[PDB]
Amino acid sequence: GSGVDAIATIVELVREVVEPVIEAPFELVDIEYGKIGSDMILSIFVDKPEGITLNDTADLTEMISPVLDTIKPDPFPEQYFLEITSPGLERPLKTKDAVAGAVGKYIHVGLYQAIDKQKVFEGTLLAFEEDELTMEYMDKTRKKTVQIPYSLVSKARLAVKLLE
C-alpha cells in the first residue's frame, strides 16, 4: 500500500464517470478489478428495479466504453479484461443448480397459475431430490409441507424466514 496508485485511481474516475452518463434507470451497484491468469478483469456491478438481462449488459458497457479509455493518468499495459454484470440478489433460482444447492432456505415463488390454489407463496426449501423440492409453504396464515415440480417458476427469489 501507498499514496499513489492506478488501481485505486481508476475506481475514483470510473465512479466519477459512471454517474454523469447512465443517469438511471440502471443504478450503479459497485466496481472492482480481479486477477485472471494474466489479465486485469474489470467488473462493473449494476442493479435494476426489476428486469435487466444479457441484452442490457451489452448496452450498458457500450455506454461506459466511451468513458473507459480516458481514465488518465493511467495507461494500462495492454492485457486487461472488462465485464459487466448485475447482482440481482446473491443466489437466485435461475437454474435447478441453485435449487438443488440451496436446500435449507426460505424461498418465495410466483406462478402464472398456481401450485396449490395460490399464485405466490412463501416457503422454506428443506431439500431437493428426484427433480422435486420439498418445502414448507406459507399462505393465508397456513404453514404446511408441499412438493413443488420443476418447470413452473416465474418469480422465484431468495428469502430468509425471520431474522432471529
Coordinates of N, CA and C in Angstrom, one line a residue:
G1 N 0.8 -1.2 0.0 CA 0.0 0.0 0.0 C 0.8 1.3 0.0
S2 N 0.3 2.4 -0.5 CA 1.0 3.6 -0.5 C 0.0 4.8 -1.0
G3 N 0.6 5.9 -1.2 CA -0.2 7.1 -1.6 C -0.7 6.9 -3.0
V4 N 0.2 7.0 -4.0 CA -0.1 6.9 -5.4 C -0.6 5.5 -5.7
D5 N -1.4 5.4 -6.7 CA -1.9 4.1 -7.1 C -2.9 4.2 -8.3
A6 N -2.7 3.4 -9.3 CA -3.5 3.4 -10.5 C -4.8 2.7 -10.3
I7 N -4.8 1.5 -9.8 CA -5.9 0.7 -9.5 C -7.0 1.5 -8.7
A8 N -6.6 2.1 -7.6 CA -7.4 2.9 -6.8 C -7.9 4.1 -7.5
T9 N -6.9 4.7 -8.2 CA -7.2 5.9 -9.0 C -8.3 5.6 -10.1
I10 N -8.3 4.4 -10.6 CA -9.3 4.0 -11.6 C -10.7 4.0 -11.0
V11 N -10.8 3.5 -9.8 CA -12.1 3.4 -9.1 C -12.7 4.8 -9.0
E12 N -11.9 5.7 -8.6 CA -12.4 7.1 -8.4 C -12.9 7.7 -9.7
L13 N -12.2 7.6 -10.7 CA -12.6 8.1 -12.0 C -13.8 7.3 -12.6
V14 N -13.7 6.0 -12.6 CA -14.7 5.1 -13.1 C -16.1 5.4 -12.4
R15 N -16.0 5.8 -11.1 CA -17.2 6.2 -10.4 C -17.7 7.6 -10.8
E16 N -16.7 8.5 -10.9 CA -17.0 9.9 -11.3 C -17.4 10.0 -12.7
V17 N -17.3 8.9 -13.5 CA -17.7 8.9 -14.9 C -18.9 8.1 -15.1
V18 N -19.3 7.2 -14.1 CA -20.4 6.4 -14.2 C -21.7 7.1 -14.0
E19 N -21.6 8.1 -13.0 CA -22.8 8.9 -12.7 C -23.2 9.8 -13.8
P20 N -22.3 10.7 -14.3 CA -22.6 11.6 -15.4 C -22.6 10.8 -16.8
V21 N -23.4 9.8 -16.9 CA -23.5 9.1 -18.2 C -24.8 8.3 -18.3
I22 N -25.0 7.3 -17.5 CA -26.2 6.4 -17.4 C -27.4 7.2 -16.9
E23 N -27.2 7.9 -15.8 CA -28.2 8.7 -15.1 C -29.5 7.9 -15.0
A24 N -29.4 6.7 -14.4 CA -30.6 5.8 -14.3 C -31.2 5.5 -15.7
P25 N -32.2 4.6 -15.7 CA -32.7 3.9 -14.6 C -31.7 2.9 -13.9
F26 N -30.8 2.4 -14.8 CA -29.8 1.4 -14.3 C -29.0 2.1 -13.2
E27 N -29.1 1.6 -12.0 CA -28.4 2.2 -10.9 C -27.0 1.4 -10.7
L28 N -26.0 2.1 -10.4 CA -24.7 1.5 -10.2 C -24.6 0.9 -8.8
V29 N -24.2 -0.4 -8.8 CA -24.0 -1.1 -7.5 C -22.6 -1.0 -7.0
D30 N -21.6 -1.3 -7.8 CA -20.2 -1.2 -7.4 C -19.3 -1.5 -8.6
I31 N -18.0 -1.4 -8.3 CA -17.0 -1.7 -9.4 C -15.7 -2.1 -8.7
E32 N -15.0 -3.1 -9.3 CA -13.8 -3.6 -8.8 C -13.0 -4.3 -9.9
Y33 N -11.8 -4.7 -9.6 CA -10.9 -5.4 -10.6 C -10.4 -6.8 -10.0
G34 N -10.2 -7.7 -10.9 CA -9.7 -9.0 -10.4 C -8.5 -9.5 -11.2
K35 N -7.9 -10.6 -10.7 CA -6.7 -11.1 -11.4 C -7.0 -12.5 -12.0
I36 N -7.1 -12.5 -13.4 CA -7.4 -13.7 -14.1 C -6.2 -14.2 -14.9
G37 N -5.4 -15.1 -14.4 CA -4.2 -15.6 -15.1 C -3.2 -14.5 -15.3
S38 N -3.4 -13.6 -16.3 CA -2.5 -12.6 -16.6 C -3.2 -11.4 -17.3
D39 N -4.4 -11.1 -16.8 CA -5.3 -10.0 -17.4 C -6.1 -9.4 -16.3
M40 N -6.1 -8.1 -16.2 CA -6.9 -7.4 -15.2 C -8.3 -7.3 -15.6
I41 N -9.2 -8.1 -14.9 CA -10.6 -8.1 -15.2 C -11.3 -7.0 -14.5
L42 N -12.1 -6.3 -15.2 CA -12.9 -5.2 -14.6 C -14.4 -5.7 -14.5
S43 N -15.0 -5.5 -13.3 CA -16.3 -5.9 -13.1 C -17.2 -4.8 -12.6
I44 N -18.0 -4.2 -13.5 CA -18.9 -3.2 -13.1 C -20.3 -3.7 -12.7
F45 N -20.6 -3.7 -11.4 CA -21.8 -4.3 -10.9 C -22.9 -3.2 -10.9
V46 N -24.0 -3.5 -11.7 CA -25.1 -2.6 -11.8 C -26.4 -3.3 -11.4
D47 N -27.3 -2.5 -10.8 CA -28.6 -3.1 -10.3 C -29.8 -2.4 -11.0
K48 N -30.9 -3.2 -11.1 CA -32.1 -2.7 -11.8 C -33.3 -2.8 -10.9
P49 N -34.4 -2.0 -11.2 CA -35.6 -2.1 -10.4 C -36.3 -3.4 -10.5
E50 N -36.4 -4.0 -11.6 CA -37.0 -5.3 -11.8 C -37.0 -5.7 -13.3
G51 N -35.9 -6.4 -13.7 CA -35.8 -6.8 -15.1 C -34.4 -7.1 -15.5
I52 N -33.8 -6.2 -16.3 CA -32.4 -6.4 -16.7 C -32.2 -7.7 -17.5
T53 N -31.0 -7.9 -18.1 CA -30.8 -9.1 -18.8 C -29.4 -9.1 -19.5
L54 N -29.1 -10.1 -20.3 CA -27.8 -10.1 -21.0 C -27.8 -9.0 -22.1
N55 N -29.0 -8.6 -22.6 CA -29.0 -7.5 -23.6 C -28.7 -6.2 -23.0
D56 N -29.1 -5.9 -21.7 CA -28.8 -4.7 -21.0 C -27.4 -4.5 -20.7
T57 N -26.7 -5.6 -20.4 CA -25.3 -5.6 -20.1 C -24.5 -5.1 -21.3
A58 N -24.7 -5.7 -22.5 CA -24.0 -5.3 -23.7 C -24.2 -3.8 -24.0
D59 N -25.4 -3.3 -23.7 CA -25.7 -1.9 -24.0 C -25.1 -1.0 -22.9
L60 N -25.1 -1.5 -21.6 CA -24.5 -0.8 -20.5 C -23.0 -0.5 -20.7
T61 N -22.3 -1.6 -21.0 CA -20.9 -1.5 -21.3 C -20.6 -0.5 -22.4
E62 N -21.3 -0.7 -23.5 CA -21.1 0.2 -24.7 C -21.2 1.7 -24.2
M63 N -22.0 1.9 -23.2 CA -22.2 3.3 -22.7 C -21.0 3.7 -21.9
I64 N -20.4 2.8 -21.1 CA -19.2 3.1 -20.3 C -18.0 3.1 -21.1
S65 N -17.9 2.4 -22.2 CA -16.8 2.3 -23.1 C -16.2 3.7 -23.4
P66 N -17.0 4.6 -23.9 CA -16.6 6.0 -24.3 C -15.8 6.6 -23.2
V67 N -16.2 6.4 -21.9 CA -15.6 6.9 -20.8 C -14.7 5.9 -20.0
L68 N -14.2 4.9 -20.8 CA -13.4 3.8 -20.2 C -12.0 4.0 -20.6
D69 N -11.8 4.5 -21.8 CA -10.4 4.6 -22.4 C -9.9 6.1 -22.2
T70 N -10.4 6.7 -21.1 CA -10.0 8.1 -20.8 C -9.8 8.3 -19.3
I71 N -9.5 7.2 -18.6 CA -9.3 7.3 -17.1 C -7.9 7.6 -16.8
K72 N -7.3 8.6 -17.4 CA -5.9 9.0 -17.2 C -5.8 9.9 -16.0
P73 N -4.6 10.1 -15.3 CA -3.4 9.3 -15.8 C -3.5 7.9 -15.3
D74 N -3.4 7.0 -16.3 CA -3.4 5.5 -16.0 C -3.4 4.7 -17.3
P75 N -2.3 4.7 -18.0 CA -2.2 4.0 -19.3 C -1.9 2.5 -19.1
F76 N -2.9 1.7 -18.9 CA -2.7 0.2 -18.6 C -1.8 -0.4 -19.7
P77 N -1.1 -1.4 -19.3 CA -0.1 -2.1 -20.2 C -0.8 -2.5 -21.5
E78 N -1.8 -3.4 -21.4 CA -2.5 -3.9 -22.6 C -3.4 -5.1 -22.2
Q79 N -2.8 -6.0 -21.4 CA -3.5 -7.2 -21.0 C -4.5 -6.9 -19.9
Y80 N -5.7 -6.4 -20.3 CA -6.7 -6.0 -19.4 C -8.1 -6.4 -19.9
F81 N -8.9 -7.1 -19.1 CA -10.2 -7.6 -19.4 C -11.3 -6.8 -18.7
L82 N -12.5 -6.7 -19.4 CA -13.6 -5.9 -18.8 C -14.9 -6.7 -19.0
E83 N -15.8 -6.6 -18.0 CA -17.0 -7.3 -18.0 C -18.1 -6.6 -17.1
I84 N -19.3 -6.6 -17.6 CA -20.4 -6.0 -16.9 C -21.5 -7.1 -16.4
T85 N -21.8 -7.0 -15.2 CA -22.8 -8.0 -14.7 C -23.7 -7.4 -13.6
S86 N -24.9 -8.0 -13.3 CA -25.8 -7.5 -12.3 C -25.7 -8.4 -11.1
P87 N -26.0 -7.8 -9.9 CA -26.0 -8.6 -8.6 C -27.3 -9.4 -8.5
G88 N -28.4 -8.7 -8.7 CA -29.7 -9.4 -8.6 C -30.1 -9.7 -7.1
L89 N -29.4 -10.6 -6.5 CA -29.6 -10.9 -5.1 C -28.4 -11.5 -4.5
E90 N -28.0 -12.8 -4.9 CA -26.9 -13.5 -4.4 C -26.8 -14.9 -4.9
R91 N -28.0 -15.5 -5.0 CA -28.1 -16.9 -5.5 C -29.6 -17.2 -5.8
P92 N -30.1 -16.6 -6.9 CA -31.4 -16.9 -7.4 C -31.7 -18.3 -7.8
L93 N -32.9 -18.6 -8.2 CA -33.2 -20.0 -8.6 C -33.3 -20.0 -10.2
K94 N -32.5 -19.2 -10.8 CA -32.5 -19.2 -12.3 C -32.4 -20.6 -12.9
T95 N -31.6 -21.4 -12.2 CA -31.4 -22.8 -12.7 C -31.6 -23.8 -11.5
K96 N -31.9 -25.0 -11.9 CA -32.0 -26.1 -10.8 C -30.8 -26.2 -10.0
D97 N -29.6 -25.8 -10.5 CA -28.4 -25.9 -9.8 C -28.4 -25.1 -8.5
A98 N -29.2 -24.0 -8.6 CA -29.3 -23.2 -7.4 C -30.3 -23.8 -6.4
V99 N -31.4 -24.4 -7.0 CA -32.4 -25.0 -6.1 C -31.8 -26.2 -5.4
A100 N -31.2 -27.1 -6.2 CA -30.6 -28.3 -5.6 C -29.5 -28.0 -4.6
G101 N -28.9 -26.8 -4.8 CA -27.8 -26.4 -4.0 C -28.3 -25.7 -2.7
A102 N -29.3 -24.9 -2.8 CA -29.8 -24.2 -1.7 C -30.1 -25.1 -0.5
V103 N -31.2 -25.8 -0.6 CA -31.5 -26.8 0.5 C -31.3 -26.2 1.9
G104 N -32.4 -25.7 2.4 CA -32.4 -25.1 3.8 C -32.6 -23.6 3.8
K105 N -33.3 -23.1 2.8 CA -33.5 -21.6 2.7 C -35.0 -21.3 2.5
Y106 N -35.3 -20.0 2.8 CA -36.7 -19.6 2.7 C -36.9 -19.0 1.3
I107 N -37.7 -19.6 0.5 CA -38.0 -19.1 -0.9 C -39.4 -18.7 -1.1
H108 N -39.6 -17.7 -2.0 CA -40.9 -17.3 -2.5 C -41.0 -17.5 -4.0
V109 N -42.1 -18.1 -4.4 CA -42.3 -18.4 -5.8 C -43.7 -18.0 -6.3
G110 N -43.7 -17.2 -7.4 CA -45.0 -16.8 -8.0 C -45.2 -17.5 -9.4
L111 N -46.2 -18.2 -9.5 CA -46.5 -18.9 -10.7 C -47.6 -18.2 -11.5
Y112 N -47.7 -18.4 -12.8 CA -48.7 -17.8 -13.7 C -50.1 -18.2 -13.3
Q113 N -50.2 -19.5 -12.8 CA -51.5 -20.0 -12.4 C -51.6 -20.2 -10.9
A114 N -51.0 -21.4 -10.5 CA -51.0 -21.7 -9.1 C -50.5 -23.1 -8.8
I115 N -49.8 -23.4 -7.7 CA -49.3 -24.7 -7.4 C -50.3 -25.4 -6.4
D116 N -50.9 -24.6 -5.5 CA -51.8 -25.2 -4.5 C -52.9 -24.2 -4.2
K117 N -53.6 -23.7 -5.2 CA -54.7 -22.8 -5.0 C -54.1 -21.4 -4.6
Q118 N -52.9 -21.1 -5.1 CA -52.3 -19.8 -4.8 C -51.2 -19.5 -5.9
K119 N -51.1 -18.2 -6.2 CA -50.1 -17.8 -7.2 C -48.7 -17.6 -6.6
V120 N -48.7 -16.8 -5.5 CA -47.4 -16.5 -4.8 C -47.5 -16.9 -3.4
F121 N -46.5 -17.8 -3.0 CA -46.4 -18.2 -1.6 C -45.0 -18.2 -1.1
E122 N -44.8 -18.2 0.2 CA -43.5 -18.2 0.9 C -43.3 -19.5 1.6
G123 N -42.2 -20.1 1.3 CA -41.9 -21.4 2.0 C -40.4 -21.7 2.0
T124 N -40.0 -22.5 3.0 CA -38.6 -22.9 3.2 C -38.3 -24.2 2.5
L125 N -37.4 -24.2 1.6 CA -37.0 -25.4 0.8 C -36.1 -26.3 1.7
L126 N -36.7 -27.3 2.2 CA -36.0 -28.3 3.1 C -35.0 -29.2 2.4
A127 N -35.3 -29.5 1.1 CA -34.4 -30.4 0.4 C -34.8 -30.6 -1.0
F128 N -33.8 -31.1 -1.9 CA -34.1 -31.3 -3.3 C -33.7 -32.7 -3.7
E129 N -34.7 -33.5 -4.1 CA -34.5 -34.9 -4.5 C -35.5 -35.4 -5.5
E130 N -35.1 -36.1 -6.5 CA -36.0 -36.6 -7.6 C -36.6 -35.5 -8.4
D131 N -35.8 -34.5 -8.8 CA -36.3 -33.4 -9.5 C -37.4 -32.7 -8.8
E132 N -37.5 -32.8 -7.5 CA -38.6 -32.3 -6.7 C -38.1 -31.5 -5.5
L133 N -38.7 -30.4 -5.2 CA -38.3 -29.6 -4.0 C -39.3 -29.7 -2.9
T134 N -38.9 -30.3 -1.7 CA -39.7 -30.4 -0.6 C -39.6 -29.2 0.3
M135 N -40.7 -28.4 0.4 CA -40.6 -27.2 1.2 C -41.9 -26.9 1.9
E136 N -41.8 -26.2 3.0 CA -42.9 -25.8 3.9 C -43.5 -24.5 3.4
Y137 N -44.7 -24.5 2.8 CA -45.3 -23.3 2.2 C -46.1 -22.6 3.3
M138 N -46.2 -21.3 3.0 CA -47.0 -20.4 3.9 C -48.0 -19.6 3.0
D139 N -49.3 -19.6 3.4 CA -50.3 -18.9 2.7 C -51.5 -18.7 3.6
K140 N -52.0 -17.5 3.6 CA -53.2 -17.1 4.4 C -53.1 -17.7 5.8
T141 N -52.0 -17.4 6.5 CA -51.7 -17.9 7.9 C -51.9 -19.5 7.9
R142 N -51.2 -20.1 7.0 CA -51.2 -21.6 6.9 C -49.8 -22.1 6.5
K143 N -49.2 -22.8 7.5 CA -47.9 -23.4 7.3 C -48.0 -24.9 7.2
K144 N -47.7 -25.4 5.9 CA -47.8 -26.8 5.7 C -46.6 -27.2 4.8
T145 N -46.5 -28.5 4.5 CA -45.5 -29.0 3.6 C -46.1 -29.4 2.3
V146 N -45.4 -29.0 1.2 CA -45.9 -29.3 -0.1 C -44.7 -29.5 -1.1
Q147 N -45.0 -30.4 -2.1 CA -44.0 -30.7 -3.1 C -44.2 -29.8 -4.3
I148 N -43.1 -29.2 -4.8 CA -43.1 -28.3 -5.9 C -42.4 -28.9 -7.1
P149 N -43.1 -29.0 -8.3 CA -42.5 -29.6 -9.5 C -41.1 -28.9 -9.9
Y150 N -40.8 -29.0 -11.1 CA -39.5 -28.4 -11.6 C -39.7 -27.9 -13.1
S151 N -40.4 -26.8 -13.2 CA -40.6 -26.1 -14.6 C -41.8 -25.2 -14.5
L152 N -42.1 -24.5 -13.4 CA -43.2 -23.6 -13.3 C -42.8 -22.4 -12.4
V153 N -41.5 -22.1 -12.3 CA -41.1 -20.9 -11.6 C -41.0 -19.7 -12.4
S154 N -41.8 -18.6 -12.0 CA -41.8 -17.4 -12.7 C -41.2 -16.3 -11.9
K155 N -41.5 -16.2 -10.6 CA -41.0 -15.2 -9.7 C -40.4 -15.9 -8.5
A156 N -39.3 -16.6 -8.7 CA -38.6 -17.3 -7.6 C -37.4 -16.4 -7.1
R157 N -37.4 -16.0 -5.9 CA -36.3 -15.3 -5.3 C -35.9 -15.8 -3.9
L158 N -34.7 -15.5 -3.5 CA -34.2 -16.0 -2.2 C -34.9 -15.2 -1.1
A159 N -35.0 -15.9 0.1 CA -35.6 -15.2 1.2 C -35.1 -15.9 2.5
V160 N -35.3 -15.1 3.6 CA -34.9 -15.6 4.9 C -36.0 -15.5 5.9
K161 N -36.4 -16.7 6.4 CA -37.5 -16.8 7.4 C -37.2 -16.1 8.7
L162 N -37.7 -14.9 8.9 CA -37.5 -14.1 10.1 C -36.0 -13.8 10.2
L163 N -35.7 -13.0 11.2 CA -34.3 -12.6 11.4 C -33.7 -13.4 12.6
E164 N -34.4 -13.5 13.7 CA -34.0 -14.2 14.8 C -34.1 -15.7 14.6

